[PDB]
A = this chain, B = another copy of it.
Amino acid sequence: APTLSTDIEMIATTMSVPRQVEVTEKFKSLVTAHNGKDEEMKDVAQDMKNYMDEKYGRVWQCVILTGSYWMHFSHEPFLSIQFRYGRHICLAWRTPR
């Protein structure tokens, strides 16, 4: 404890459990504040990106999605997190500057 909540499925991350908990709990609070509406998920992606820049340094990208996904950023190591909360998959990783 603090422990990863039971309604998050961690898919892949190079971040520690304390960071996983802050990131996922923040995402859940944002989605809840926006009543889970897809129509407002852009605000959520933006507020997640700003939260992460502030807290863990720039530059973050945030992708929220439904369905499946396949990605490539870099074979070299970089700060990253991928998880599922309900219907929404959340991707976030940090790039230079």
- B49, B66, B67, B70: the one contacting A72 at CB < 8 Å is B49
**Segment from A1-9, A12-20, A38-46 that makes contact with B:** A38-46
Known contacts A59-B95, A61-B61, A97-B96: does B71 contact A68 (CB below 8 Å)? no
Chain A contact surface mostly: mixed
Residues in chain B near residue A46, CB distance under 8 A? 72
- Judge if A62 is at the interface, Cβ distance under 8 Å: yes
**Number of chain A interface residues as a range:** 20 to 34
Complex: A42 Cα to B69 Cα, angstroms: 9
Residues in chain B near residue A74, CB distance under 8 A? 59
| A23-50, CB < 8 A from B | 38, 41-42, 44-46, 48-49
Using CB atoms and an 8 Å cutoff, list the residues of chain A in contact with chain B: 38, 41-42, 44-46, 48-49, 59, 61-74, 91, 95-97
